Design a protein around this ligand. Structure first.
Ligand SMILES: OC[C@H]1CN(Cc2ccccc2)CCO1
Length: 152
């Protein structure tokens, strides 16, 4: 049948919100009150892929935008990009592998591992106003843990 999707926001484990940083990048800021209108609303789609109790393959689209987080090699490195797609064809159940993240639940937090690049994770910096990126460490100074908020 149709792919199933949920609207949501994400915040890193230091409670930074995610906002746009130009058309094809996200950044992480400490936000509260009126400025949380700036927060990215995701459509999280539950897609085809290897699955277990605590590890669920998803795509992360921007709500009602033909833009998806994707993992590609750039200048020879696994990177996070925002990629445009044909809005007639997305979302779909069989998303291409660069769009797939394994959403992993550990100790009441979520990590998003690249399905394409094992042990590379959606990451933020400790500093404010820095890009969201793909990080090859889920253990160090960079933040790889998130919480989800469900949106109407
Ligand atoms: O508050 C002014 C901004 C907030 N908006 C976040 C946003 C981005 C993508 C999908 C849903 C929502 C972007 C355009 O307007």
């Amino acid at each position: 049948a149709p792919v199933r999707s949920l609207n949501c926001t994400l915040r890193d484990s230091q409670q930074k919100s995610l906002v746009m940083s130009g058309p094809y990048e996200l950044k992480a800021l400490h936000l509260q009150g009126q400025d949380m209108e700036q927060q990215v609303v995701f459509s999280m789609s539950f897609v085809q892929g290897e699955e277990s109790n605590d590890k669920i393959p998803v795509a992360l689209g921007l709500k009602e935008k033909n833009l998806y987080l994707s993992c590609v090699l750039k200048d020879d490195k696994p990177t996070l990009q925002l990629e445009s797609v044909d809005p007639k064809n997305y979302p779909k159940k069989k998303m291409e592998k660069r769009f797939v993240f394994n959403k992993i639940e550990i100790n009441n937090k979520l990590e998003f591992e690249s399905a394409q690049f094992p042990n590379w994770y959606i990451s933020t910096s400790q500093a404010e106003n820095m890009p969201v990126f793909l990080g090859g460490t889920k253990g160090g100074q960079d933040i790889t843990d998130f919480t989800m908020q469900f949106v109407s």
